[PDB]
Design a protein around this ligand. Structure first.
Ligand SMILES: *[C@@H]1O[C@H](CO)[C@@H](O[C@@H]2O[C@H](CO)[C@@H](O[C@@H]3O[C@H](CO)[C@@H](O)[C@H](O)[C@@H]3O)[C@H](O)[C@H]2NC(C)=O)[C@H](O)[C@H]1NC(C)=O
Ligand SMILES: *[C@@H]1O[C@H](CO[C@@H]2O[C@@H](C)[C@@H](O)[C@@H](O)[C@@H]2O)[C@@H](O[C@@H]2O[C@H](CO)[C@@H](O)[C@H](O)[C@H]2NC(C)=O)[C@H](O)[C@H]1NC(C)=O
Ligand SMILES: *[C@@H]1O[C@H](CO[C@@H]2O[C@@H](C)[C@@H](O)[C@@H](O)[C@@H]2O)[C@@H](O[C@@H]2O[C@H](CO)[C@@H](O)[C@H](O)[C@H]2NC(C)=O)[C@H](O)[C@H]1NC(C)=O
Ligand SMILES: *[C@@H]1O[C@H](CO)[C@@H](O[C@@H]2O[C@H](CO)[C@@H](O)[C@H](O)[C@H]2NC(C)=O)[C@H](O)[C@H]1NC(C)=O
Ligand SMILES: *[C@@H]1O[C@H](CO)[C@@H](O[C@@H]2O[C@H](CO)[C@@H](O)[C@H](O)[C@H]2NC(C)=O)[C@H](O)[C@H]1NC(C)=O
Ligand SMILES: OCC[C@]1(CO)NC[C@H](O)[C@@H](O)[C@@H]1O
Ligand SMILES: [Cl-]
Ligand SMILES: [Cl-]
Ligand SMILES: [Cl-]
Ligand SMILES: [Cl-]
Ligand SMILES: [Cl-]
Length: 860
């Protein structure tokens, strides 16, 4: 009964240090491991679970009763449960386990012919078994361990199909999670990213790879503090401190299909405004309008693109929301109007917590919040008071419809004073400088629960508000992990109402489904080579979770950057879907114009290339928004049948076609990256115009094409270089240079056409006005497909409207042209001019065409 293979031992003492006698008293096996680790106290196969009874078939699927006869060692076991199994789509299986006698907290969320899955049940002990129909692989099997279902402790386990599992944000981790007895804690926490810690967000979703390259996904729709325990059998245990078991299985079979299927439940990513894809520049310490204006002037003088100027807390009156000081920021409204007049946008920090200490009637956000009962309340029904920047603060309850109306009003009123273009919502874990409240917290089972997950500080109260505090929908205990998400929803709505165009919200704290409303930055990362490297898996992870608008603070936030690190970080950071350089108060400056000439040239090239690629990056955001695609994606999402890609997370793709192989270490002049099977063209063979000086071309010419069998390749990568390769068979739209997207969007466009050996390629362009609401619903867009075939390039017009009708195509660069053409035609007429490079196999064609009018370019 205790002959259980070590890797297959499930912990019978997750709650406390236990003795052999206590362990055997629990009906468990005590066997010390021979050297988190393998549990010494573990469940025999006979450990009491639930029994399945009265399984019944409905049109949607199945229902049953689950009955526990022997209590567990947790208090308040729920001895009778109800199982509901819903066969919702061919790709999506959904089951819930609930208390049929009591409504329990549930997360608020908007809802051959055969399924890809089959489902069976173990009677005793109870388990759900989910097979992939096509190959019979066991994907879920909850029979592997007992079901625990107590008022403050839920535990459901499964086997995993492989050692390869990704998800369960937010943590500083490789993209593929360690199955070596790893405890992953979901409890939104203000902490500078560091290993083994619960960070700002919580996404209870994993994607598991299967031998051969198929995959499935599992979503536990549960917002309670939880541990997820991975063990090397391999197996996973969900351990939640409340709510219900609400489980979605997504059958793929392709990893990209698993992500789309998950986003069909939690929501497709929001479409950002085009300007949001430009460069953002921020620091803590731009302490006046004069200093802030000098930033834009200094960027412009040195020919650095900048779409969005930001401020941190500097702008506020005594660090209070919806104010600006009348010292350094007396002319704040004029500064923001000037930014707009120059074709730029403006962003500023907003905190959730509202100053509670000002004289009555002197501070409308607090006074009006009090009147309308918007704040989280304590035992006596008064506002819970904590401490953040302004001092004493109350915490808005963004589950209260009246708080949403109050937040809408405060945002609209402040926008009437200063016409900001979006919101940077920080400290929304929610972060508290003191423990719980100024008044501490009561002694109850929510503050002191029977199972405390592995949170930093060992309490749910650490760096946040009391767990037993009251919100409109439930206690903070149940809603904590949604705080940031609820603020992002409230802010998205506020900005729509205030501005009448697409909102731009960047949030610290997140939950599953955040991407439907907002983007994310990875928080208080150190200016270190280790954090540069760590940013790549974290940006990829957020893309798998449907938050494609993600990035890290370019050059890093905490401490002092070096010039070399800032060059490398700007190079990689130009491929973050959200690109902002942000910097801490006491740090040395790290704006692009603050470095040496050679470092400026490299940074200017990185920003020039990003601006040139914005039509393509915007098109990838359209695919995310309409089809649940990723924008930045790991190689294994694009080439899952190549197992060599599974552990790659220091390279990234943009969409299907652009492979970015950054240098992530000091003193390197080369980089080794994985190239999937195919031809990869060096993007340096595509001509790009810059407004300012770029690095001199390299001393030694580089290989124009990598012809890979699926292999590791060492690339030259001097300080002034980042490796970017374009996949053969793809066409990329580009647009001419500008210091803003207002300027760049007016420029003529270009195509980069990467031919297969067989002379084929395909690409697309999505174009709209860059900021209106309801574009897709109203049809206010242009959509064009580009096709290369048999020495011809054509466009196919999917939709052409006024937005996109004027788009000028002036250059076509064709890669992989084996022989000098004798003639190049545009619509049957010899072109004005073309160049062919025999060394690089590049055909560069000058044309005068319209994206929105059928053309035919040919060569022979
Ligand atoms: C629920 O939250 C309210 C705040 O909204 C808490 O009110 C606070 O109650 C404490 C006493 O328990 C007050 O401290 C007292 O301050 C006065 C003078 O300011 C001093 O003379 C007393 O010796 C004492 O320190 C505190 O002022 C008050 N805070 C505010 C903003 O009024 C209440 O305690 C909370 N209830 C629970 C059970 O946590
Ligand atoms: C499993 O179900 C049986 C039978 O339940 C009946 O049929 C169902 C479809 C539904 O219509 C129920 O309302 C019916 O009662 C349960 O056994 C019955 O228990 C009831 C009440 O305790 C008793 O009056 C009946 O005589 C029992 N019927 C039989 C045929 O034994 C049983 O309790 C269910 N098991 C669990 C664990 O809930
Ligand atoms: C980040 O750097 C600052 C500033 O460093 C100083 O100024 C630079 C131009 C450079 O020449 C450095 O070598 C200088 O030391 C550090 O703040 C300084 O810290 C020292 C020692 O604690 C203190 O005596 C100085 O007065 C500080 N100078 C200023 C202008 O604030 C800071 O410690 C560095 N941060 C980290 C994390 O190492
Ligand atoms: C699901 O997991 C359960 C438990 O690990 C598996 O059932 C065990 O299988 C072994 C080996 O065949 C038996 O000797 C044990 O008696 C089984 N235990 C129980 C509780 O039944 C089961 O095989 C797995 N299901 C699938 C399809 O893999
Ligand atoms: C913008 O650039 C100007 C000019 O380089 C900076 O002003 C100089 O700052 C140095 C300190 O490093 C002073 O000693 C000089 O007096 C300034 N020179 C001039 C010509 O004014 C300025 O600090 C930059 N501002 C920002 C916000 O980056
Ligand atoms: O806490 C000090 C830093 C700061 C101040 O607003 N808050 C936390 C954010 O993560 C930072 O980006 C931000 O600069
Ligand atoms: Cl002992
Ligand atoms: Cl007013
Ligand atoms: Cl509740
Ligand atoms: Cl390999
Ligand atoms: Cl032409």
């Amino acid at each position: 009964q205790c002959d259980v293979p070590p890797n297959s031992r499930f912990d019978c003492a997750p709650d406390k240090a236990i003795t052999q006698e206590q362990c055997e008293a629990r009906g468990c096996c005590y066997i010390p491991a021979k050297q988190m680790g393998q549990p010494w106290c573990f469940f025999p196969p006979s450990y009491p679970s639930y029994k399945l009874e009265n399984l019944s078939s409905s049109e949607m699927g199945y229902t049953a009763t689950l009955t526990r006869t022997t209590p567990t060692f947790f208090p308040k076991d729920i001895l009778t449960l109800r199982l509901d199994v819903m066969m919702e789509t061919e790709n999506r299986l959904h089951f819930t386990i609930k208390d049929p006698a009591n409504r329990r907290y549930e997360v608020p969320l908007e809802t051959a012919p055969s399924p890809l899955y089959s489902v069976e049940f173990s009677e005793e002990p109870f388990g759900v078994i989910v097979h992939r129909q096509l190959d019979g692989r066991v994907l879920l099997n909850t029979t592997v361990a007992p079901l625990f279902f107590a008022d403050q402790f839920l535990q459901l386990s499964t086997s995993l199909p492989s050692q390869y599992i990704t998800g369960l944000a937010e943590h500083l981790s490789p993209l593929m999670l360690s199955t070596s007895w790893t405890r992953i804690t979901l409890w939104n926490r203000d902490l500078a990213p560091t290993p083994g810690a619960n960070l700002y967000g919580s996404h209870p979703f994993y994607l598991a790879l299967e031998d051969g390259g198929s995959a499935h996904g599992v979503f536990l729709l549960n917002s309670n503090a939880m541990d997820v325990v991975l063990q090397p059998s391999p197996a996973l245990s969900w351990r939640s401190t409340g709510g219900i078991l609400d489980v979605y299985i997504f059958l793929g079979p392709e990893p990209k299909s698993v992500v789309q299927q998950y986003l069909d439940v939690v929501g497709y990513p929001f479409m950002p405004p085009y300007w949001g894809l430009g460069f953002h520049l921020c620091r803590w310490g731009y302490s006046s309008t004069a200093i802030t204006r000098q930033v834009v002037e200094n960027m412009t003088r040195a020919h650095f693109p900048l779409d969005v100027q930001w401020n941190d807390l500097d702008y506020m009156d005594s660090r209070r929301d919806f104010t600006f000081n009348k010292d350094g920021f007396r002319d704040f409204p004029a500064m923001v109007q000037e930014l707009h007049q120059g074709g730029r946008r403006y962003m500023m920090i907003v905190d959730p917590a509202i100053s509670s200490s000002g004289p009555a009637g002197s501070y409308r956000p607090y006074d009006e919040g009090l009147r309308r009962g918007v704040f989280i309340t304590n035992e006596t029904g008064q506002p819970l008071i904590g401490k953040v920047w302004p001092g004493s603060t109350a915490f808005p309850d963004f589950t209260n419809p009246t708080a949403l109306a109050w937040w809408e009003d405060m945002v609209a009123e402040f926008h009437d004073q200063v016409p900001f273009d979006g919101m940077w919502i920080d400290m929304n874990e929610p972060s508290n400088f003191i423990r719980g409240s100024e008044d501490g917290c009561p002694n109850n089972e929510l503050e002191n629960p029977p199972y405390v997950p592995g949170v930093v500080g060992g309490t749910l109260q650490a760096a946040t508000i009391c767990a037993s505090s009251h919100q409109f929908l439930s206690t903070h205990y149940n809603l904590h992990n949604l705080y940031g998400l609820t603020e992002a929803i409230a802010s998205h709505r506020a900005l729509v109402k205030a501005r009448g165009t697409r909102p731009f919200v960047i949030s610290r704290s997140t939950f599953a489904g955040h991407g439907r409303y907002a983007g994310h930055w990875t928080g208080d990362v150190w200016s270190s080579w280790e954090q540069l490297a760590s940013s790549v898996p974290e940006i990829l992870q957020f893309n798998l979770l449907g938050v494609p608008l993600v990035g890290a603070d370019v050059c890093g936030f905490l401490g002092n950057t070096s010039e070399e690190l800032c060059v490398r970080w700007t190079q990689l950071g130009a491929f973050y879907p959200f690109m902002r350089n942000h910097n801490s108060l006491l740090s040395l400056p790290q704006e692009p114009y603050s470095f040496s000439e050679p470092a400026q040239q490299a940074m200017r090239k990185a920003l020039t290339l990003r601006y040139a690629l914005l039509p393509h990056l915007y098109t990838l955001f359209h695919q995310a928004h309409v089809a649940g695609e990723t924008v930045a994606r790991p190689l294994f999402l694009e080439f899952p049948k190549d197992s060599s890609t599974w552990t790659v997370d220091h390279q990234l793709l943009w969409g299907e076609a652009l492979l970015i192989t950054p240098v992530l270490q000091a003193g390197k002049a080369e980089v080794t990256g994985y190239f999937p099977l195919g031809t990869w063209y060096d993007l340096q063979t595509v001509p790009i115009e810059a407004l300012g000086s770029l690095p001199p071309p390299p001393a030694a010419p580089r290989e124009p094409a990598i012809h890979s069998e699926g292999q590791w390749v060492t690339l030259p990568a001097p300080l002034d270089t980042i490796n970017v390769h374009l996949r053969a068979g793809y066409i990329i739209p580009l647009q001419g240079p500008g210091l803003t997207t207002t300027e760049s969007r007016q420029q003529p466009m270009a195509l980069a056409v990467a031919l297969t050996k067989g002379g084929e390629a395909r690409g697309e362009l999505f174009w709209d006005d860059g900021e209106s609401l309801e574009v897709l619903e109203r049809g206010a867009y242009t959509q064009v497909i580009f096709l290369a075939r048999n020495n011809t390039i054509v466009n196919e017009l999917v939709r052409v409207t006024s937005e996109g009708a004027g788009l000028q195509l002036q250059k076509v660069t064709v890669l992989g042209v084996a022989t000098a053409p004798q003639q190049v035609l545009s619509n049957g007429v010899p072109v004005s001019n073309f160049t062919y490079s025999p060394d690089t196999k590049v055909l560069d064609i000058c044309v005068s065409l319209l994206m929105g009018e059928q053309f035919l370019v040919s060569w022979c």
